[PDB]
């Protein structure tokens, strides 16, 4: 188990760690989060009590170093930093634990929710989508734009998602115009799976990453990316059998974990109804179909 200590908490803020969150009062004696499960990536995120605008946060993997949070009063936000001096860091942590000023990552033992949401998410791959190579952790916020959004302005602050475009030359083979547009299997299997992502694990990794950024930060271009990667699969007549079964599990836990009051802006009516009721794979998403109907039957 690992720890992310906080220097202090000077401004009142809601802090999330994965799917958990805690309210911290201005200058309350808060000094970090302990008992963080090793072996998965994690995200620690923030929403200030005074500007409910700009949710922001850090993707990180505790196996890649010692990380802490420090408020910056010039830039006005909680920053993630790496401590390179290992003894200095254990010392800080042990002292804060001894004073019981840390919250415990509150995982129920029966619960596999976070595993299931982050199964294919890889921290080393996260750093190729969020490019800032002097840090081992990755910053994301509500407002950041994706590479594709920028095409249709600052490249350093961009989410480099895999551009997916159903009316593009990458998607449509010359002479198979109709074939490839109505059955995207060529684009899924040859262009994207074999060409770009190399395997399905990677594809699912980006898809889960995009969903988590949409849910935790309300990042709109991430939501567009998650829906696009679902639609590419659902619009392919030929999908490996193991991918369909795993897709159903992925989407189930994403729909399960969504706040009930956010389905209006995070869920795209057209994509879901087409994936569940019109597409080739309309019959291959039993769990995801069952949870969608019992929990959001309005959308459909």
């Amino acid at each position: 188990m690992n720890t992310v200590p906080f220097t202090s908490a000077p401004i009142e803020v809601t802090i999330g760690i994965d799917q958990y969150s805690f309210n911290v009062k201005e200058n309350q004696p808060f000094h970090g989060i302990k008992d963080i499960p090793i072996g998965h990536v994690h995200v620690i995120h923030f929403q200030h009590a005074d500007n409910s605008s700009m949710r922001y946060g850090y993707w990180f993997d505790c196996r890649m170093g010692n990380f802490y949070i420090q408020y910056d009063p010039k830039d006005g936000l909680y920053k993630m930093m790496e401590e390179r001096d290992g003894a200095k860091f254990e010392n800080i942590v042990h002292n804060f634990k001894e004073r019981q000023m840390m919250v415990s990552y509150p995982k129920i033992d029966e619960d596999d929710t976070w595993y299931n949401l982050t199964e294919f998410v890889q921290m080393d791959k996260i750093r190729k989508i969020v490019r800032k190579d002097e840090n081992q952790f990755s910053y994301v916020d509500s407002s950041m734009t994706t590479v594709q959004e920028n095409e249709l302005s600052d490249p350093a602050h961009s989410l480099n998602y895999t551009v997916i475009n159903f009316k593009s030359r990458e998607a449509i083979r010359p002479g198979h115009e109709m074939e490839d547009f109505l059955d995207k299997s060529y684009y899924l299997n040859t262009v994207m799976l074999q060409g770009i992502f190399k395997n399905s694990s990677n594809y699912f990794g980006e898809l889960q990453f995009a969903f988590l950024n949409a849910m935790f930060f309300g990042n709109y271009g991430s939501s567009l990316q998650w829906h696009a990667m679902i639609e590419l699969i659902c619009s392919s007549a030929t999908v490996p059998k193991h991918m369909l079964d795993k897709l159903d599990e992925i989407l189930y836990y994403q729909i399960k974990t969504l706040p009930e009051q956010y389905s209006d802006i995070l869920l795209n009516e057209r994509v879901w109804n087409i994936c569940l009721y019109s597409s080739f794979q309309k019959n291959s998403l039993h769990n995801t179909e069952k949870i969608m109907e019992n929990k959001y039957p309005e959308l459909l």
Partner: protein
């Protein structure tokens, strides 16, 4: 954006554009089988591709053989239309290629867009206008060359005959849409009007009769009257 009553006049500026109408591409007679089931038999169709400024009509005849052994023909027809329109553009010299293509039915947008990916600077536009181009098969010479075709074939016409020697594109397009609106709403009456006088003839190289300017006004009037009456009948007003 979409073409409508408000940007109507853009059709007659000097940027090349084409209308594409696919209504008559896939044509069937529906009939009964020996066992009492219903079956379709296709007949030849055409793509109606028109430059509204010049009157040049690119009539691509769609021979029934293009449907042989194919499923979901009404869906295929939209892609075949898009394939043929794209092939036409590629066949034209660069300075003759359109800057816009306006499809008369919105279901053509995606098929045409995908087929024209090689021409990113050609705008594919829908329209809110209810244009009467389905009535093109009520023009005898167009109907005749489509039905007689024994293979795929492109036939070129000027749908305005020689009208542009005497009138502008705007007025010629209005005359054309009025003639086609009348033919669409009551073909029998519409055609009675155009040929009633055996002394007015159609030149071998034309589609419509050689009316003087004054006879065109009498014609156009008679075509309006037909269109209104039919409307009171249609709706009882």
């Amino acid at each position: 954006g979409a073409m409508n009553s408000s940007n109507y006049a853009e059709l007659f500026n000097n940027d090349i554009k084409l209308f594409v109408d696919d209504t008559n591409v896939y044509r069937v007679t529906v009939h009964k089988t020996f066992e009492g089931n219903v079956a379709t038999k296709a007949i030849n169709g055409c793509i109606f591709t028109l430059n509204p400024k010049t009157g040049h009509l690119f009539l691509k005849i769609i021979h029934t053989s293009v449907w042989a052994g194919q499923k979901r023909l009404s869906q295929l027809a939209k892609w075949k239309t898009a394939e043929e329109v794209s092939a036409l553009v590629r066949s034209l010299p660069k300075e003759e290629q359109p800057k816009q293509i306006i499809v008369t039915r919105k279901a053509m947008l995606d098929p045409l867009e995908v087929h024209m990916l090689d021409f990113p600077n050609i705008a594919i536009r829908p329209t809110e206008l209810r244009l009467p181009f389905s009535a093109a098969m009520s023009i005898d010479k167009l109907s005749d060359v489509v039905m007689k075709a024994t293979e795929p074939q492109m036939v070129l016409f000027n749908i305005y005959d020689d009208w542009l020697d005497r009138i502008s594109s705007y007025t010629a397009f209005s005359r054309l849409t009025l003639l086609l609106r009348a033919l669409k709403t009551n073909e029998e009456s519409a055609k009675m009007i155009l040929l009633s006088d055996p002394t007015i003839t159609i030149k071998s190289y034309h589609l419509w009769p050689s009316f003087t300017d004054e006879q065109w006004i009498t014609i156009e009037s008679q075509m309006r009257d037909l269109i209104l009456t039919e409307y009171g009948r249609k709706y009882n007003v």
